[PDB]
Write a protein that binds this ligand. Structure first.
Ligand SMILES: [Mg+2]
Ligand SMILES: [Mg+2]
Ligand SMILES: [Mg+2]
Ligand SMILES: [Mg+2]
Ligand SMILES: [Mg+2]
Ligand SMILES: [Mg+2]
Ligand SMILES: [Mg+2]
Ligand SMILES: [Mg+2]
Ligand SMILES: [Mg+2]
Ligand SMILES: [Mg+2]
Ligand SMILES: [Mg+2]
Ligand SMILES: [Mg+2]
Ligand SMILES: [Mg+2]
Lengths: 103, 61, 138, 199, 69, 142, 70
RNA sequence: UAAUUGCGAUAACGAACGAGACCUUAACCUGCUAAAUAGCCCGUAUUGCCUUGGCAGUACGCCGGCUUCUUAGAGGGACUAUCGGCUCAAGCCGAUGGAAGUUUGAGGCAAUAACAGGUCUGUGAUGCCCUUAGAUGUUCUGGGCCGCACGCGCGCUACACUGACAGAGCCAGCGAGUACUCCCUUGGCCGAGAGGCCCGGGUAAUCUUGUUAAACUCUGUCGUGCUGGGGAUAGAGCAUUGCAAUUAUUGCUCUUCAACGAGGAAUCCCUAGUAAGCGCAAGUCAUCAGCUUGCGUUGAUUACGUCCCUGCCCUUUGUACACACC
């Protein structure tokens, strides 16, 4: 049982679904008497595309701005290697998760 | 020239074809009994003081 | 322990964070003293919080300020705001506010903008700032 | 210590300009007060005010600020207020040596004298003009006086060996009295003359 | 219209007998009535400065003004 | 009391440091003077004859205040706008050789040294105290 | 600054259903409204609270037509 | 009243769309939840100067403390509240407080009925007609779309001293970035210059990047002369991109030094961080932005109106018009 000081990164487009994942994940580890470090707030990355409305070029000239936003909220923990497998189970749609032992 | 000083006591609408001119009621501030009607070109508030080169012209309406 | 309080002043995009520590009457901004950090003609807009109040009221105060972002004249408006906020915040915490209320009332009577910021930003538009392109035949 | 030795000279006395005090203001006329603001002194004119939100809010503003802003025009000089403040300060020194009076003493009398008192208004006559020769409000008088003084200096210094520092200075002393050889006086009397005809 | 880049005795004497009465002396003034070039006017400006006849009021990279002593 | 670089006006300090290096009289010169443009954006060589020496004094002044600097950073620090003709102007950087050799020659004067641990050039133990000593030449000059 | 029918109609029913529970104070009336009503916007709730406290100020001096409470 | 927004009157009563509500964003929180891919105080080590006890920097801490500044979550905050003056009412005008009092500021979405508006050259959406092996299919070589006595539109650079040139001083924000092949690029050396070579970082709040941009500020030179204002036109040389640069792709050095002195009749845009000045990022992209979509810096003059011109909405009224005053 050797601690490896794990770190977990998250990504999703929704904002409400992602937040409650961390809320239950921190509680799933806190009750197990594990020293947990806070849910840092990474910058939101917004990317946009602008294009002209008309498909032929006639008439007045008008554009529209599409948008897309991403949030991260990465988390890290100090725990053994095998225990962390059972703590990240039962995740819902939308949120993507990446595991790093950070040994 | 016997230039006279007057002070504004009331503003009465905006006249003119394009609203540039305004119509005010003035007070001679030396003989408080007399009062006439004049026209002014610029922005005007109550208790403003105006200078009159001649005091016998009056104005329409 | 040591008596200190932190205040900040803002402009369009100029942030001036300041820490006032009980000292001996020394004021320096970005390391350099007040002799340097300003355009020569704009140096006048830095001393007002002192003359209106008096140098005798800066007997044992030390101030260090770090400022970044914005422009030349925007920055000097931020730092002059931090000086006013530093002296009034330190007085509230550690000494009777009879000075502070007298400090606050006198300071804003000369100029309200010394203690409060002016909210102003730009507006995006699809023609430029606010004007459109030229028309051919109306 | 923390302040330069120069400013320690004035801190003991009443607050004032770089050199000149706003005390001993003229007693010459009426109807021009309440629109030229000198009760609140300013060290340097430059200020980020809120004078363009209401009707008469800009009436409560130092005249030097009003003069300084109007000095920068004609495309090239847009937003270059730092240059304008330097010109005003240097011009104020030039007039001081040629006349023992205060530089603001000259500037105030220049404005109060070059403001037209009557003007002709445009009333349609189906292609003709029924100029009625209306009166002028005090606020417009000071606003138009500033424009006349500044545009005269800007015209003279164009393609001239002289600089705007003293071209502006020489007009103010000219406009202090009835010199009649200044740009402002030439236009002011011309406007009043045509108004009399259309009475 | 054109001025003189060199200073002769006909112009040198003009300085030392007339500048004692000037209220202001500037680059424009010398080019105006002395009919001399601006470069010479600046040269004439600094040489007499140390001679102790005029005093500086304000100094700047744009304009310079001097008055009586 | 004690003074440092930050305690003196920048314009007179660099001028003062130009005067000191006259009396020391030991700064390498590679013959580039009187021919170089000091920048692609420009058109005329510098007017003042001892421009190679006044620039070095100012260059060593900011390295005293900056932690790591290289030739590339100084190339664009000294750049300015270029008149491309009738097209709108842009921003281009200064010459590389001028700024590179002015600090390569400044290496052997024992003013600042290399920083191979992470890159760039930093100020040396005895280099920084030399520029501190000339500060008192200006502060009490008052 | 004129209030529409949704603000005015909703204010009428609140006053007659719960007259004594809310008073001339604007701050207290703000907390009365959200407990006894379903409002989907904070700004909409503020406007409703603003009008109902205005109505009772003139109620204090004589009744007004269009209003009836027990 | 910004509004068929309301107060109300009423042969009408009760309702459905549009407006408003609403959604994104810009301004406020020393209160909550926090953070070595964001900072500060503090403690070690260490440097210079006064020496004091000081002042200004360096490197380290990973449970030493903390969250004002940075960051994104949960919520709070304005309702015209309070005060004074008009009115029966809906409401309007001024002041005080306050981060904020025009619907707080700026946007997204947006009804019925229509036009012979634009698009078959966006679509493997599509009727009919046409050509289909000497092809209107596809593909390879070469050229053209840029050809110039002339008229018109959207822009760029200027006619200088409120300027040009030379040294020094020195302040932003929104964004983009590595494959089955190199995409943004720090540092070192060589090189007048543009460029070249060798290690290396970053799939990115971690590296480029503090993108120390331009205008601007201080000190000098030139001196009103179309002159050191202005950079069109043209010769020669050295380089980079690509399979290929001539009808020059673009970039750098030397030389050539045109018109143009504030512009006729006419005419476009605009109300506060707004006009104008100046630069940066992205889009198209092997290379080329004087164009567009966004970002910040500096920052004003003038109105707080009217229906006179060019037009819009509702009512009364006239008509020989209904393809509707062309
Ligand atoms: Mg735009
Ligand atoms: Mg703009
Ligand atoms: Mg344009
Ligand atoms: Mg331009
Ligand atoms: Mg809105
Ligand atoms: Mg073509
Ligand atoms: Mg590699
Ligand atoms: Mg970093
Ligand atoms: Mg020429
Ligand atoms: Mg590009
Ligand atoms: Mg195009
Ligand atoms: Mg009839
Ligand atoms: Mg009919």
């Amino acid at each position: 049982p050797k601690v490896h000081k794990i770190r977990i990164t998250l990504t999703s487009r929704k904002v409400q679904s992602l937040e409650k994942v961390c809320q239950e994940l921190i509680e799933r580890a806190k009750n197990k008497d594990l020293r947990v470090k806070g849910p840092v707030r990474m910058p939101t990355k917004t990317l946009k595309i602008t294009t002209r409305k008309t498909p032929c070029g006639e008439g007045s000239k008008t554009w529209d701005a599409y948008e897309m936003r991403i949030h991260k909220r990465l988390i890290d923990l100090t725990a053994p290697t095998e225990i962390v497998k059972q703590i990240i189970i039962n995740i819902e749609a939308g949120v993507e998760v990446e595991v790093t032992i950070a040994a | 020239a016997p230039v006279k000083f007057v002070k504004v006591t009331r503003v009465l609408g905006r006249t003119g074809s394009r609203g540039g001119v305004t119509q005010v009621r003035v007070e001679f501030m030396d003989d408080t009994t007399r009062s006439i009607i004049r026209n002014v070109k610029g922005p005007v508030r109550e208790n403003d003081i105006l200078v009159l080169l001649e005091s016998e012209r009056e104005a329409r309406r | 322990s040591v008596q200190a309080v932190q205040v900040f002043g803002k402009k369009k995009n100029a942030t001036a964070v300041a820490r006032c520590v009980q000292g001996k009457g020394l004021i320096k901004v970005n390391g350099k003293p007040l002799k340097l950090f300003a355009p020569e003609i704009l140096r006048a807009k830095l001393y007002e919080p002192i003359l209106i109040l008096g140098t005798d009221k800066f007997a044992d105060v030390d101030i260090r300020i770090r400022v970044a972002g914005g422009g030349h004249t925007s920055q000097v408006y931020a730092v002059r705001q931090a000086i006013a906020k530093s002296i009034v915040a330190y007085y509230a915490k550690y000494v009777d506010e009879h000075s502070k209320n007298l400090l606050k009332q006198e300071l804003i009577q000369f100029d309200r903008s010394l203690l409060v910021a002016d909210p102003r930003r730009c507006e995006p538009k699809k023609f430029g700032g606010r004007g459109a392109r030229a028309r051919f035949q109306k | 210590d923390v302040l330069p030795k120069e400013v320690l000279a004035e801190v003991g006395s009443v607050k004032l300009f770089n050199r000149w005090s706003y005390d001993d203001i003229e007693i010459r006329d009426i109807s021009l007060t309440d629109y030229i603001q000198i009760r609140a002194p300013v060290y340097i004119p430059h200020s980020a005010g809120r004078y363009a939100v209401k009707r008469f809010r800009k009436a409560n503003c130092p005249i030097i600020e009003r003069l300084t802003n109007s000095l920068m025009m004609h495309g090239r000089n847009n937003g270059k207020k730092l240059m304008a403040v330097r010109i005003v300060a240097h011009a104020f020194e030039i007039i001081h040596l040629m006349t023992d009076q205060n530089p603001i003493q000259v500037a105030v009398d220049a404005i109060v004298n070059c403001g037209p008192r009557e003007d002709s208004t445009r009333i349609g006559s189906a292609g003709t003009v029924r100029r009625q020769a209306v009166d002028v409000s005090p606020l417009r008088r000071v606003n138009q006086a500033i424009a006349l003084l500044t545009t005269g200096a800007r015209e003279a210094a164009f393609r001239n060996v002289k600089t705007i520092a003293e071209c502006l200075a020489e007009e103010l002393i000219n406009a202090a009295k009835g010199s009649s050889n200044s740009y402002a006086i030439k236009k002011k009397d011309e406007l009043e003359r045509v108004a009399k005809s259309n009475r | 219209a054109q001025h003189s880049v060199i200073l002769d005795k006909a112009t040198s004497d003009k300085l030392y007998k007339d500048v004692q009465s000037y209220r202001l002396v500037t680059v424009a003034t010398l080019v105006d009535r002395l009919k001399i070039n601006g470069a010479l006017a600046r040269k004439c400006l600094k040489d007499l400065e140390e001679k102790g006849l005029i005093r500086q009021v304000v100094g700047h990279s744009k304009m310079k003004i001097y008055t009586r002593a | 009391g004690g003074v440092t670089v930050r305690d003196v006006d920048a314009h007179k300090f660099v001028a003062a440091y130009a005067a000191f290096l006259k009396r020391q009289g030991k700064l390498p010169v590679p013959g580039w003077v009187d021919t170089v443009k000091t920048g692609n954006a420009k058109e005329l060589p510098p007017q003042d004859i001892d421009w190679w020496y006044i620039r070095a004094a100012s260059v060593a002044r900011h390295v005293y205040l900056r932690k790591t600097v290289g030739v590339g950073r100084l190339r664009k620090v000294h750049g300015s706008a270029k008149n491309r003709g009738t097209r709108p102007s842009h921003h281009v950087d200064a010459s590389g050789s001028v700024d590179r050799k002015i600090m390569q020659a400044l290496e052997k004067i024992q003013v600042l040294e290399k920083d191979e641990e992470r890159g760039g050039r930093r100020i040396t133990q005895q280099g920084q105290r030399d520029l501190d000593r000339i500060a008192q030449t200006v502060a009490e000059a008052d | 600054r004129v209030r529409t029918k949704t603000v005015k109609k909703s204010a009428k029913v609140i006053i007659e259903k719960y007259y004594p529970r809310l008073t001339l104070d604007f701050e207290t009336n703000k907390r009365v409204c959200d407990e006894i009503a379903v409002i989907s916007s904070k700004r909409l709730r503020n406007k409703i609270a603003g009008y109902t406290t205005h109505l009772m100020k003139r109620i204090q001096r004589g009744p007004v037509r269009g209003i009836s409470f027990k």
